[PDB]
Amino acid sequence: DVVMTQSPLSLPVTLGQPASISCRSSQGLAFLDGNTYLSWFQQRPGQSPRRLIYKVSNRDSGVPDRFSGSGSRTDFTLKISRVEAEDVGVYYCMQGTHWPLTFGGGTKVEIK
Amino acid sequence: SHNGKLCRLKGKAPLQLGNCNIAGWVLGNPECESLLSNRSWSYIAETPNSENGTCFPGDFADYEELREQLSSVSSFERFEIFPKERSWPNHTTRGVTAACPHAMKSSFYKNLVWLTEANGSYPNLSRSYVNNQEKEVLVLWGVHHPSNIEDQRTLYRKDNAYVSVVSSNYNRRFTPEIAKRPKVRGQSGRINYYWTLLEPGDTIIFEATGNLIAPWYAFALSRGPGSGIITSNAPLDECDTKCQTPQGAINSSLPFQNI
Amino acid sequence: RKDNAYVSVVSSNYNRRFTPEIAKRPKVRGQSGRINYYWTLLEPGDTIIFEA
Ligand SMILES: *[C@@H]1O[C@H](CO)[C@@H](O[C@@H]2O[C@H](CO)[C@@H](O[C@@H]3O[C@H](CO[C@H]4O[C@H](CO[C@H]5O[C@H](CO)[C@@H](O)[C@H](O)[C@@H]5O)[C@@H](O)[C@H](O)[C@@H]4O)[C@@H](O)[C@H](O[C@H]4O[C@H](CO)[C@@H](O)[C@H](O)[C@@H]4O[C@H]4O[C@H](CO)[C@@H](O)[C@H](O)[C@@H]4O)[C@@H]3O)[C@H](O)[C@H]2NC(C)=O)[C@H](O)[C@H]1NC(C)=O
Ligand SMILES: *[C@@H]1O[C@H](CO)[C@@H](O[C@@H]2O[C@H](CO)[C@@H](O)[C@H](O)[C@H]2NC(C)=O)[C@H](O)[C@H]1NC(C)=O
Ligand SMILES: *[C@@H]1O[C@H](CO)[C@@H](O)[C@H](O)[C@H]1NC(C)=O
Numbered sequence A: 001d002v003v004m005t006q007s008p009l010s011l012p013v014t015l016g017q018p019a020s021i022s023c024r025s026s027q028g029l030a031f032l033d034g035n036t037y038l039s040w041f042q043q044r045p046g047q048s049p050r051r052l053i054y055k056v057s058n059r060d061s062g063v064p065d066r067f068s069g070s071g072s073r074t075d076f077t078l079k080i081s082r083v084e085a086e087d088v089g090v091y092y093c094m095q096g097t098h099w100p101l102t103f104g105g106g107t108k109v110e111i112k
Numbered sequence B: 001s002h003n004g005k006l007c008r009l010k011g012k013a014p015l016q017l018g019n020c021n022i023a024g025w026v027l028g029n030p031e032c033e034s035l036l037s038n039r040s041w042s043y044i045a046e047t048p049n050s051e052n053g054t055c056f057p058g059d060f061a062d063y064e065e066l067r068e069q070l071s072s073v074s075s076f077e078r079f080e081i082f083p084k085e086r087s088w089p090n091h092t093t094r095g096v097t098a099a100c101p102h103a104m105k106s107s108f109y110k111n112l113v114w115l116t117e118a119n120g121s122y123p124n125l126s127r128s129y130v131n132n133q134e135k136e137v138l139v140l141w142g143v144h145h146p147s148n149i150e151d152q153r154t155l156y157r158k159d160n161a162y163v164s165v166v167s168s169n170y171n172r173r174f175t176p177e178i179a180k181r182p183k184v185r186g187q188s189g190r191i192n193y194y195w196t197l198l199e200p201g202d203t204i205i206f207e208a209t210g211n212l213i214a215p216w217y218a219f220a221l222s223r224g225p226g227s228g229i230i231t232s233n234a235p236l237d238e239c240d241t242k243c244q245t246p247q248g249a250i251n252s253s254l255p256f257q258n259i
Numbered sequence C: 001r002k003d004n005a006y007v008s009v010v011s012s013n014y015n016r017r018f019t020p021e022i023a024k025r026p027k028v029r030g031q032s033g034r035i036n037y038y039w040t041l042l043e044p045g046d047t048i049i050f051e052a
Protein backbone atom coordinates (compact mmCIF):
# COMPACT_ATOMS: atom_id res chain seq x y z
CA ASP A 1 0.00 0.00 0.00
CA VAL A 2 0.97 3.66 0.47
CA VAL A 3 2.48 4.51 3.86
CA MET A 4 1.51 7.90 5.31
CA THR A 5 3.53 9.41 8.17
CA GLN A 6 2.29 12.31 10.31
CA SER A 7 4.36 14.61 12.52
CA PRO A 8 4.13 15.21 15.39
CA LEU A 9 2.10 12.66 17.37
CA SER A 10 1.06 15.19 20.03
CA LEU A 11 1.12 18.97 19.50
CA PRO A 12 0.10 20.92 22.62
CA VAL A 13 -0.61 24.54 21.73
CA THR A 14 -1.81 27.56 23.71
CA LEU A 15 -4.99 29.53 22.84
CA GLY A 16 -4.38 32.07 20.09
CA GLN A 17 -1.21 30.44 18.73
CA PRO A 18 -0.70 28.77 15.33
CA ALA A 19 -0.24 25.01 14.89
CA SER A 20 1.04 22.85 12.04
CA ILE A 21 0.74 19.14 11.17
CA SER A 22 2.83 17.48 8.46
CA CYS A 23 1.81 14.47 6.33
CA ARG A 24 4.25 12.57 4.11
CA SER A 25 3.66 9.78 1.58
CA SER A 26 5.88 7.09 0.08
CA GLN A 27 4.74 7.68 -3.52
CA GLY A 28 3.66 10.66 -5.57
CA LEU A 29 -0.06 11.36 -5.42
CA ALA A 30 -0.59 12.93 -8.85
CA PHE A 31 -3.35 11.43 -11.00
CA LEU A 32 -3.78 11.32 -14.77
CA ASP A 33 -6.61 13.85 -14.64
CA GLY A 34 -4.34 16.48 -13.10
CA ASN A 35 -5.19 16.47 -9.37
CA THR A 36 -3.71 15.15 -6.12
CA TYR A 37 -6.66 13.92 -3.95
CA LEU A 38 -5.42 14.24 -0.36
CA SER A 39 -7.87 14.93 2.46
CA TRP A 40 -7.60 16.12 6.08
CA PHE A 41 -10.15 15.04 8.73
CA GLN A 42 -10.94 16.09 12.29
CA GLN A 43 -12.27 13.71 14.96
CA ARG A 44 -13.67 15.05 18.22
CA PRO A 45 -13.79 12.72 21.26
CA GLY A 46 -16.84 10.46 21.14
CA GLN A 47 -18.04 11.59 17.71
CA SER A 48 -17.90 10.66 14.04
CA PRO A 49 -15.10 12.02 11.83
CA ARG A 50 -15.85 15.04 9.67
CA ARG A 51 -13.99 16.43 6.68
CA LEU A 52 -11.94 19.62 6.77
CA ILE A 53 -9.78 19.72 3.63
CA TYR A 54 -10.54 17.96 0.30
CA LYS A 55 -7.73 18.06 -2.30
CA VAL A 56 -4.57 20.02 -1.41
CA SER A 57 -5.99 23.53 -1.06
CA ASN A 58 -9.79 23.39 -1.27
CA ARG A 59 -11.75 23.86 1.95
CA ASP A 60 -15.08 22.20 2.70
CA SER A 61 -18.28 24.16 3.30
CA GLY A 62 -18.93 25.01 6.93
CA VAL A 63 -15.23 24.73 7.82
CA PRO A 64 -13.82 27.88 9.49
CA ASP A 65 -11.31 30.00 7.58
CA ARG A 66 -8.55 29.34 10.15
CA PHE A 67 -7.90 25.88 8.62
CA SER A 68 -5.54 26.11 5.63
CA GLY A 69 -3.70 23.27 3.93
CA SER A 70 -1.07 23.22 1.22
CA GLY A 71 1.66 20.95 -0.12
CA SER A 72 3.04 19.18 -3.15
CA ARG A 73 4.79 15.99 -4.34
CA THR A 74 5.38 14.00 -1.18
CA ASP A 75 5.11 16.62 1.60
CA PHE A 76 1.89 18.28 2.79
CA THR A 77 0.98 20.54 5.72
CA LEU A 78 -2.18 21.63 7.53
CA LYS A 79 -1.96 24.93 9.44
CA ILE A 80 -4.26 26.52 12.02
CA SER A 81 -3.76 30.26 12.51
CA ARG A 82 -5.76 30.56 15.75
CA VAL A 83 -6.43 27.60 18.05
CA GLU A 84 -9.70 27.64 20.00
CA ALA A 85 -11.49 25.25 22.34
CA GLU A 86 -13.39 23.63 19.45
CA ASP A 87 -10.06 22.66 17.84
CA VAL A 88 -9.37 19.71 20.14
CA GLY A 89 -9.24 16.19 18.77
CA VAL A 90 -7.31 13.95 16.41
CA TYR A 91 -6.44 14.96 12.85
CA TYR A 92 -5.87 12.52 9.96
CA CYS A 93 -4.67 12.56 6.35
CA MET A 94 -5.78 10.24 3.53
CA GLN A 95 -4.84 9.74 -0.11
CA GLY A 96 -7.46 8.94 -2.73
CA THR A 97 -5.29 8.18 -5.75
CA HIS A 98 -3.91 4.65 -5.34
CA TRP A 99 -5.59 1.42 -4.33
CA PRO A 100 -6.20 0.78 -1.50
CA LEU A 101 -7.37 3.78 0.50
CA THR A 102 -4.88 4.59 3.27
CA PHE A 103 -5.31 6.76 6.37
CA GLY A 104 -2.68 8.45 8.51
CA GLY A 105 -1.59 7.63 12.02
CA GLY A 106 -3.26 10.61 13.67
CA THR A 107 -2.17 13.78 15.48
CA LYS A 108 -3.72 14.76 18.82
CA VAL A 109 -4.14 18.45 19.72
CA GLU A 110 -4.35 19.46 23.40
CA ILE A 111 -4.74 22.92 24.91
CA LYS A 112 -2.07 24.24 27.28
CA SER B 1 -0.30 32.78 -15.82
CA HIS B 2 0.68 35.01 -12.90
CA ASN B 3 -0.90 37.35 -10.36
CA GLY B 4 0.97 40.39 -11.64
CA LYS B 5 1.47 41.52 -8.04
CA LEU B 6 4.34 41.36 -5.57
CA CYS B 7 3.37 39.78 -2.26
CA ARG B 8 4.66 37.84 0.75
CA LEU B 9 6.62 34.58 0.66
CA LYS B 10 6.66 32.05 3.56
CA GLY B 11 4.83 34.69 5.67
CA LYS B 12 7.46 37.48 5.40
CA ALA B 13 7.04 40.85 3.71
CA PRO B 14 9.67 41.88 1.15
CA LEU B 15 11.94 44.89 1.52
CA GLN B 16 10.70 47.40 -1.05
CA LEU B 17 13.33 50.08 -1.59
CA GLY B 18 11.04 52.45 -3.49
CA ASN B 19 12.93 55.28 -5.19
CA CYS B 20 16.15 54.39 -3.31
CA ASN B 21 18.86 52.01 -4.49
CA ILE B 22 21.23 49.88 -2.39
CA ALA B 23 23.92 52.60 -2.15
CA GLY B 24 21.40 55.19 -0.99
CA TRP B 25 20.05 52.72 1.55
CA VAL B 26 23.43 51.86 3.05
CA LEU B 27 24.85 55.40 2.98
CA GLY B 28 21.71 56.94 4.46
CA ASN B 29 20.30 59.16 1.73
CA PRO B 30 17.92 61.83 3.16
CA GLU B 31 15.03 60.61 0.98
CA CYS B 32 15.54 57.05 2.31
CA GLU B 33 14.70 57.68 5.97
CA SER B 34 11.92 55.07 6.03
CA LEU B 35 14.34 52.21 5.32
CA LEU B 36 16.52 53.08 8.35
CA SER B 37 14.63 50.93 10.86
CA ASN B 38 15.61 47.53 12.15
CA ARG B 39 13.57 44.88 10.40
CA SER B 40 13.57 41.57 8.53
CA TRP B 41 12.50 40.45 5.06
CA SER B 42 12.40 37.55 2.62
CA TYR B 43 13.59 39.20 -0.62
CA ILE B 44 14.54 42.68 -1.82
CA ALA B 45 12.43 44.51 -4.41
CA GLU B 46 13.78 47.44 -6.42
CA THR B 47 12.51 49.94 -8.97
CA PRO B 48 14.32 49.55 -12.33
CA ASN B 49 14.94 53.33 -12.53
CA SER B 50 15.89 54.61 -9.08
CA GLU B 51 17.32 58.13 -8.90
CA ASN B 52 18.18 58.52 -5.19
CA GLY B 53 21.65 57.13 -4.55
CA THR B 54 24.99 58.85 -3.99
CA CYS B 55 23.80 62.46 -3.91
CA PHE B 56 27.38 63.71 -3.76
CA PRO B 57 29.33 62.55 -6.85
CA GLY B 58 32.03 59.95 -6.48
CA ASP B 59 32.93 56.31 -7.00
CA PHE B 60 31.46 53.50 -4.89
CA ALA B 61 34.18 50.88 -4.50
CA ASP B 62 33.02 47.27 -5.08
CA TYR B 63 29.34 48.14 -5.47
CA GLU B 64 28.36 44.91 -7.24
CA GLU B 65 30.23 42.83 -4.66
CA LEU B 66 28.25 44.67 -1.96
CA ARG B 67 25.05 43.75 -3.82
CA GLU B 68 26.17 40.11 -3.96
CA GLN B 69 26.88 40.13 -0.21
CA LEU B 70 23.56 41.84 0.60
CA SER B 71 21.60 39.38 -1.56
CA SER B 72 21.72 36.61 1.08
CA VAL B 73 20.92 38.73 4.17
CA SER B 74 17.80 38.15 6.28
CA SER B 75 17.95 41.08 8.72
CA PHE B 76 20.00 44.02 9.97
CA GLU B 77 20.44 45.95 13.23
CA ARG B 78 21.37 49.64 12.87
CA PHE B 79 23.63 50.68 15.75
CA GLU B 80 25.72 53.77 16.47
CA ILE B 81 29.36 52.82 15.92
CA PHE B 82 30.72 56.30 16.75
CA PRO B 83 28.54 58.82 18.64
CA LYS B 84 28.45 62.19 16.92
CA GLU B 85 28.45 64.40 20.02
CA ARG B 86 31.02 62.68 22.22
CA SER B 87 33.52 60.91 19.96
CA TRP B 88 34.65 64.14 18.24
CA PRO B 89 35.46 66.77 20.90
CA ASN B 90 37.90 68.89 18.87
CA HIS B 91 36.25 68.99 15.43
CA THR B 92 33.11 70.49 13.90
CA THR B 93 30.57 67.76 13.18
CA ARG B 94 28.09 70.07 11.44
CA GLY B 95 28.43 69.67 7.67
CA VAL B 96 25.75 70.29 5.05
CA THR B 97 25.78 70.38 1.26
CA ALA B 98 23.46 71.57 -1.50
CA ALA B 99 23.84 68.38 -3.54
CA CYS B 100 21.82 66.47 -0.92
CA PRO B 101 18.67 68.48 -0.11
CA HIS B 102 16.01 67.59 2.46
CA ALA B 103 12.74 69.60 2.60
CA MET B 104 14.15 72.49 0.49
CA LYS B 105 17.21 72.77 2.75
CA SER B 106 20.83 71.56 2.83
CA SER B 107 21.66 68.29 4.58
CA PHE B 108 24.06 65.33 4.49
CA TYR B 109 23.94 61.54 4.76
CA LYS B 110 22.41 60.04 7.89
CA ASN B 111 25.18 57.46 8.46
CA LEU B 112 28.26 59.61 7.74
CA VAL B 113 29.81 62.62 9.49
CA TRP B 114 31.79 65.33 7.67
CA LEU B 115 34.60 66.49 9.95
CA THR B 116 36.01 69.98 9.43
CA GLU B 117 38.48 72.22 11.30
CA ALA B 118 37.61 73.70 14.70
CA ASN B 119 39.16 76.99 15.94
CA GLY B 120 41.70 77.07 13.11
CA SER B 121 43.17 73.63 13.82
CA TYR B 122 42.68 70.05 12.62
CA PRO B 123 44.22 67.68 15.21
CA ASN B 124 45.39 64.14 14.40
CA LEU B 125 42.61 61.51 14.59
CA SER B 126 42.82 57.90 15.82
CA ARG B 127 39.74 55.84 16.71
CA SER B 128 39.22 52.10 17.20
CA TYR B 129 36.19 49.82 17.31
CA VAL B 130 35.96 46.26 18.67
CA ASN B 131 33.19 43.85 17.67
CA ASN B 132 31.21 42.13 20.43
CA GLN B 133 27.88 41.66 18.64
CA GLU B 134 28.59 38.02 17.59
CA LYS B 135 27.83 38.81 13.92
CA GLU B 136 29.27 40.64 10.92
CA VAL B 137 29.26 44.44 10.95
CA LEU B 138 29.17 46.45 7.72
CA VAL B 139 31.35 49.56 8.13
CA LEU B 140 31.06 52.41 5.61
CA TRP B 141 33.21 55.52 5.20
CA GLY B 142 34.43 57.99 2.60
CA VAL B 143 37.39 60.09 1.49
CA HIS B 144 36.95 63.65 0.19
CA HIS B 145 38.73 64.84 -2.99
CA PRO B 146 38.43 68.64 -3.32
CA SER B 147 38.69 70.76 -6.45
CA ASN B 148 41.25 73.45 -5.56
CA ILE B 149 43.90 73.99 -2.91
CA GLU B 150 42.04 76.92 -1.32
CA ASP B 151 39.11 74.71 -0.33
CA GLN B 152 41.60 72.18 1.08
CA ARG B 153 43.30 74.89 3.15
CA THR B 154 40.01 76.34 4.42
CA LEU B 155 38.52 72.98 5.39
CA TYR B 156 41.44 70.88 6.70
CA ARG B 157 44.33 73.43 7.10
CA LYS B 158 46.87 71.01 5.54
CA ASP B 159 48.18 70.77 1.99
CA ASN B 160 48.97 67.06 2.44
CA ALA B 161 46.69 64.63 4.26
CA TYR B 162 46.06 60.89 4.49
CA VAL B 163 43.52 58.37 5.75
CA SER B 164 44.51 54.90 6.94
CA VAL B 165 41.99 52.15 7.64
CA VAL B 166 43.50 49.04 9.23
CA SER B 167 41.83 45.77 10.20
CA SER B 168 42.83 42.10 10.33
CA ASN B 169 41.59 41.67 6.74
CA TYR B 170 41.62 45.29 5.46
CA ASN B 171 44.73 47.48 5.18
CA ARG B 172 44.47 50.57 3.00
CA ARG B 173 45.91 54.08 2.80
CA PHE B 174 44.19 56.91 0.93
CA THR B 175 45.57 60.24 -0.32
CA PRO B 176 43.40 63.12 -1.63
CA GLU B 177 43.84 64.25 -5.23
CA ILE B 178 43.13 67.84 -6.31
CA ALA B 179 42.23 68.30 -9.98
CA LYS B 180 39.85 70.15 -12.29
CA ARG B 181 36.66 68.16 -12.82
CA PRO B 182 33.39 68.60 -14.73
CA LYS B 183 30.39 69.64 -12.68
CA VAL B 184 28.12 66.77 -11.64
CA ARG B 185 25.01 67.78 -9.65
CA GLY B 186 26.41 71.30 -9.20
CA GLN B 187 29.62 70.16 -7.45
CA SER B 188 33.14 69.86 -8.86
CA GLY B 189 34.53 67.91 -5.89
CA ARG B 190 34.17 64.20 -5.23
CA ILE B 191 33.69 61.83 -2.29
CA ASN B 192 34.83 58.22 -2.74
CA TYR B 193 32.92 55.68 -0.66
CA TYR B 194 34.36 52.47 0.80
CA TRP B 195 33.02 49.56 2.84
CA THR B 196 34.23 46.56 4.83
CA LEU B 197 32.79 43.59 6.75
CA LEU B 198 34.10 43.04 10.27
CA GLU B 199 34.02 39.48 11.65
CA PRO B 200 33.17 38.72 15.30
CA GLY B 201 36.03 39.44 17.68
CA ASP B 202 37.86 41.71 15.22
CA THR B 203 38.86 45.36 15.55
CA ILE B 204 39.13 48.27 13.11
CA ILE B 205 41.32 51.39 13.38
CA PHE B 206 40.70 54.69 11.58
CA GLU B 207 43.57 57.19 11.51
CA ALA B 208 43.42 60.51 9.72
CA THR B 209 45.07 63.89 9.34
CA GLY B 210 42.47 65.18 6.88
CA ASN B 211 39.72 64.42 4.37
CA LEU B 212 37.74 61.84 6.35
CA ILE B 213 34.00 61.19 6.16
CA ALA B 214 33.68 59.29 9.43
CA PRO B 215 31.13 56.53 10.09
CA TRP B 216 28.14 57.25 12.31
CA TYR B 217 25.88 54.19 12.04
CA ALA B 218 26.73 50.59 11.18
CA PHE B 219 24.67 47.52 10.32
CA ALA B 220 24.80 44.17 12.12
CA LEU B 221 24.02 41.57 9.45
CA SER B 222 22.47 38.11 9.77
CA ARG B 223 22.63 35.59 6.95
CA GLY B 224 19.80 33.46 5.63
CA PRO B 225 19.26 30.50 3.31
CA GLY B 226 16.98 31.99 0.65
CA SER B 227 16.80 35.62 -0.49
CA GLY B 228 17.47 37.72 -3.56
CA ILE B 229 17.00 40.96 -5.47
CA ILE B 230 14.12 41.51 -7.92
CA THR B 231 13.62 44.49 -10.23
CA SER B 232 9.88 45.15 -10.60
CA ASN B 233 7.26 47.79 -11.38
CA ALA B 234 4.53 45.55 -9.97
CA PRO B 235 2.62 46.63 -6.84
CA LEU B 236 2.55 45.14 -3.36
CA ASP B 237 -0.42 43.08 -2.20
CA GLU B 238 -1.20 40.17 0.16
CA CYS B 239 -0.56 36.52 -0.69
CA ASP B 240 1.29 33.49 0.65
CA THR B 241 2.66 32.03 -2.58
CA LYS B 242 5.84 29.90 -2.77
CA CYS B 243 7.16 31.35 -6.05
CA GLN B 244 7.92 34.95 -7.02
CA THR B 245 8.94 36.39 -10.40
CA PRO B 246 9.46 40.05 -11.41
CA GLN B 247 6.15 39.79 -13.28
CA GLY B 248 4.09 38.23 -10.50
CA ALA B 249 3.51 35.25 -8.24
CA ILE B 250 2.94 31.74 -9.62
CA ASN B 251 0.79 29.01 -8.03
CA SER B 252 1.41 25.74 -9.84
CA SER B 253 2.46 22.17 -8.98
CA LEU B 254 3.35 21.96 -12.70
CA PRO B 255 7.04 21.19 -13.66
CA PHE B 256 7.56 23.92 -16.30
CA GLN B 257 6.93 27.61 -16.94
CA ASN B 258 7.47 30.24 -19.63
CA ILE B 259 7.15 33.55 -17.75
CA ARG C 1 68.33 54.63 8.53
CA LYS C 2 66.02 56.43 6.02
CA ASP C 3 62.51 57.77 6.50
CA ASN C 4 61.68 57.28 2.80
CA ALA C 5 62.54 54.07 0.95
CA TYR C 6 61.43 52.20 -2.15
CA VAL C 7 61.70 48.77 -3.77
CA SER C 8 61.51 48.23 -7.53
CA VAL C 9 61.28 44.86 -9.28
CA VAL C 10 61.63 45.03 -13.07
CA SER C 11 61.48 42.19 -15.59
CA SER C 12 60.33 41.88 -19.21
CA ASN C 13 56.81 40.98 -18.01
CA TYR C 14 56.87 42.37 -14.43
CA ASN C 15 57.38 46.04 -13.56
CA ARG C 16 56.30 47.17 -10.11
CA ARG C 17 57.42 49.61 -7.42
CA PHE C 18 56.63 49.26 -3.70
CA THR C 19 56.66 51.92 -0.97
CA PRO C 20 56.59 51.21 2.80
CA GLU C 21 53.56 52.37 4.80
CA ILE C 22 53.77 53.04 8.54
CA ALA C 23 50.58 52.95 10.61
CA LYS C 24 49.07 51.60 13.83
CA ARG C 25 47.99 47.99 13.38
CA PRO C 26 46.42 45.34 15.63
CA LYS C 27 48.70 42.67 17.04
CA VAL C 28 48.67 39.41 15.08
CA ARG C 29 50.92 36.61 16.43
CA GLY C 30 52.58 39.07 18.82
CA GLN C 31 53.76 41.42 16.05
CA SER C 32 52.22 44.67 14.81
CA GLY C 33 54.37 45.03 11.68
CA ARG C 34 53.67 43.37 8.34
CA ILE C 35 55.55 41.76 5.46
CA ASN C 36 53.81 41.67 2.08
CA TYR C 37 54.85 38.74 -0.10
CA TYR C 38 55.12 38.77 -3.90
CA TRP C 39 56.02 36.29 -6.63
CA THR C 40 56.77 36.14 -10.35
CA LEU C 41 57.51 33.54 -13.05
CA LEU C 42 60.59 34.10 -15.20
CA GLU C 43 60.67 32.63 -18.74
CA PRO C 44 63.82 31.12 -20.28
CA GLY C 45 66.35 33.72 -21.35
CA ASP C 46 64.74 36.49 -19.30
CA THR C 47 66.28 38.73 -16.65
CA ILE C 48 65.04 40.29 -13.41
CA ILE C 49 66.39 43.37 -11.60
CA PHE C 50 65.89 44.10 -7.89
CA GLU C 51 66.61 47.64 -6.70
CA ALA C 52 66.11 48.93 -3.19
C1 LIG D 1 50.35 64.35 13.81
O1 LIG D 1 50.81 63.38 12.88
C2 LIG D 1 52.04 63.66 12.22
C3 LIG D 1 52.29 62.54 11.23
O2 LIG D 1 52.03 61.30 11.89
C4 LIG D 1 53.18 63.81 13.22
O3 LIG D 1 54.37 64.22 12.52
C5 LIG D 1 55.58 63.60 13.03
O4 LIG D 1 56.11 64.36 14.11
C6 LIG D 1 57.30 63.84 14.70
C7 LIG D 1 57.65 64.72 15.89
O5 LIG D 1 56.61 64.62 16.87
C8 LIG D 1 58.41 63.77 13.66
O6 LIG D 1 59.58 63.14 14.21
C9 LIG D 1 60.76 63.99 14.15
O7 LIG D 1 61.61 63.80 13.01
C10 LIG D 1 62.64 64.78 12.91
C11 LIG D 1 63.48 64.50 11.67
O8 LIG D 1 64.21 63.28 11.87
C12 LIG D 1 65.38 63.30 11.04
O9 LIG D 1 66.44 64.08 11.60
C13 LIG D 1 67.02 63.54 12.79
C14 LIG D 1 68.13 64.48 13.23
O10 LIG D 1 68.85 64.86 12.05
C15 LIG D 1 69.30 66.23 12.16
O11 LIG D 1 70.16 66.59 11.08
C16 LIG D 1 69.52 66.61 9.81
C17 LIG D 1 70.55 67.00 8.75
O12 LIG D 1 71.05 68.31 9.04
C18 LIG D 1 68.36 67.59 9.80
O13 LIG D 1 67.69 67.54 8.54
C19 LIG D 1 67.38 67.24 10.91
O14 LIG D 1 66.34 68.22 10.97
C20 LIG D 1 68.12 67.20 12.24
O15 LIG D 1 68.60 68.50 12.57
C21 LIG D 1 67.56 62.14 12.53
O16 LIG D 1 68.04 61.58 13.76
C22 LIG D 1 66.47 61.25 11.96
O17 LIG D 1 67.01 59.97 11.62
C23 LIG D 1 65.87 61.89 10.72
O18 LIG D 1 66.85 61.95 9.68
C24 LIG D 1 63.51 64.75 14.15
O19 LIG D 1 64.50 65.77 14.05
C25 LIG D 1 62.66 64.99 15.39
O20 LIG D 1 63.49 64.81 16.55
C26 LIG D 1 63.24 65.79 17.60
O21 LIG D 1 62.08 65.62 18.43
C27 LIG D 1 62.17 64.54 19.35
C28 LIG D 1 60.89 64.49 20.17
O22 LIG D 1 60.73 65.73 20.86
C29 LIG D 1 63.38 64.72 20.26
O23 LIG D 1 63.50 63.59 21.13
C30 LIG D 1 64.65 64.86 19.43
O24 LIG D 1 65.75 65.14 20.30
C31 LIG D 1 64.48 66.00 18.45
O25 LIG D 1 64.36 67.22 19.20
C32 LIG D 1 64.09 68.32 18.32
O26 LIG D 1 62.92 69.03 18.73
C33 LIG D 1 63.02 69.57 20.06
C34 LIG D 1 61.71 70.25 20.43
O27 LIG D 1 61.45 71.32 19.52
C35 LIG D 1 64.19 70.54 20.13
O28 LIG D 1 64.31 71.03 21.47
C36 LIG D 1 65.47 69.83 19.73
O29 LIG D 1 66.56 70.76 19.74
C37 LIG D 1 65.30 69.25 18.33
O30 LIG D 1 65.10 70.31 17.39
C38 LIG D 1 61.57 63.94 15.44
O31 LIG D 1 62.15 62.64 15.59
C39 LIG D 1 57.92 62.94 12.49
O32 LIG D 1 58.91 62.94 11.46
C40 LIG D 1 56.64 63.52 11.93
N1 LIG D 1 56.21 62.66 10.85
C41 LIG D 1 55.74 63.13 9.70
C42 LIG D 1 56.12 64.54 9.35
O33 LIG D 1 55.05 62.44 8.96
C43 LIG D 1 52.76 64.87 14.23
O34 LIG D 1 53.72 64.99 15.29
C44 LIG D 1 51.43 64.53 14.87
N2 LIG D 1 51.11 65.62 15.75
C45 LIG D 1 50.80 65.42 17.02
C46 LIG D 1 49.44 65.89 17.45
O35 LIG D 1 51.58 64.89 17.79
C1 LIG E 1 16.09 62.11 -5.40
O1 LIG E 1 15.76 61.99 -6.80
C2 LIG E 1 15.05 63.11 -7.35
C3 LIG E 1 14.72 62.74 -8.78
O2 LIG E 1 14.23 61.41 -8.86
C4 LIG E 1 15.92 64.36 -7.23
O3 LIG E 1 15.21 65.50 -7.73
C5 LIG E 1 15.98 66.17 -8.75
O4 LIG E 1 17.08 66.94 -8.21
C6 LIG E 1 17.88 67.60 -9.20
C7 LIG E 1 19.01 68.28 -8.47
O5 LIG E 1 20.25 67.60 -8.66
C8 LIG E 1 17.02 68.56 -10.02
O6 LIG E 1 17.82 69.14 -11.05
C9 LIG E 1 15.83 67.83 -10.62
O7 LIG E 1 14.97 68.76 -11.28
C10 LIG E 1 15.05 67.09 -9.54
N1 LIG E 1 13.94 66.35 -10.12
C11 LIG E 1 12.74 66.27 -9.56
C12 LIG E 1 11.72 65.45 -10.30
O8 LIG E 1 12.48 66.82 -8.50
C13 LIG E 1 16.29 64.59 -5.77
O9 LIG E 1 17.17 65.70 -5.66
C14 LIG E 1 16.97 63.34 -5.19
N2 LIG E 1 17.26 63.54 -3.78
C15 LIG E 1 18.49 63.47 -3.27
C16 LIG E 1 18.61 63.69 -1.80
O10 LIG E 1 19.47 63.24 -3.97
C1 LIG F 1 -4.15 30.24 -8.05
O1 LIG F 1 -5.09 29.18 -7.71
C2 LIG F 1 -6.47 29.59 -7.71
C3 LIG F 1 -7.28 28.39 -7.28
O2 LIG F 1 -6.92 27.24 -8.02
C4 LIG F 1 -6.86 30.11 -9.09
O3 LIG F 1 -8.21 30.59 -9.05
C5 LIG F 1 -5.93 31.23 -9.53
O4 LIG F 1 -6.24 31.63 -10.86
C6 LIG F 1 -4.47 30.78 -9.46
N1 LIG F 1 -3.58 31.85 -9.84
C7 LIG F 1 -3.07 31.97 -11.07
C8 LIG F 1 -2.16 33.14 -11.30
O5 LIG F 1 -3.33 31.17 -11.96
Ligand SMILES: *[C@@H]1O[C@H](CO)[C@@H](O)[C@H](O)[C@H]1NC(C)=O
Residues within 6 Å of the ligand: B037, B038, B039, B077, B078, B079
Ligand atom coordinates in the same frame (compact mmCIF):
# COMPACT_ATOMS: atom_id res chain seq x y z
C1 LIG G 1 17.59 48.77 16.18
O1 LIG G 1 18.17 47.55 16.64
C2 LIG G 1 18.52 47.63 18.04
C3 LIG G 1 19.27 46.36 18.38
O2 LIG G 1 20.66 46.62 18.56
C4 LIG G 1 17.26 47.84 18.88
O3 LIG G 1 17.64 48.02 20.25
C5 LIG G 1 16.47 49.05 18.39
O4 LIG G 1 15.20 49.11 19.04
C6 LIG G 1 16.25 48.99 16.87
N1 LIG G 1 15.62 50.21 16.40
C7 LIG G 1 14.43 50.26 15.78
C8 LIG G 1 13.72 48.95 15.60
O5 LIG G 1 13.94 51.32 15.40
Ligand SMILES: *[C@@H]1O[C@H](CO)[C@@H](O)[C@H](O)[C@H]1NC(C)=O
Residues within 6 Å of the ligand: B089, B090
Ligand atom coordinates in the same frame (compact mmCIF):
# COMPACT_ATOMS: atom_id res chain seq x y z
C1 LIG H 1 40.77 67.52 22.57
O1 LIG H 1 41.17 68.75 23.20
C2 LIG H 1 41.36 68.65 24.62
C3 LIG H 1 41.65 70.04 25.12
O2 LIG H 1 43.01 70.40 24.90
C4 LIG H 1 42.47 67.65 24.92
O3 LIG H 1 42.62 67.53 26.33
C5 LIG H 1 42.15 66.30 24.30
O4 LIG H 1 43.25 65.41 24.47
C6 LIG H 1 41.84 66.44 22.81
N1 LIG H 1 41.50 65.15 22.20
C7 LIG H 1 40.45 64.37 22.49
C8 LIG H 1 40.36 63.09 21.71
O5 LIG H 1 39.60 64.66 23.34
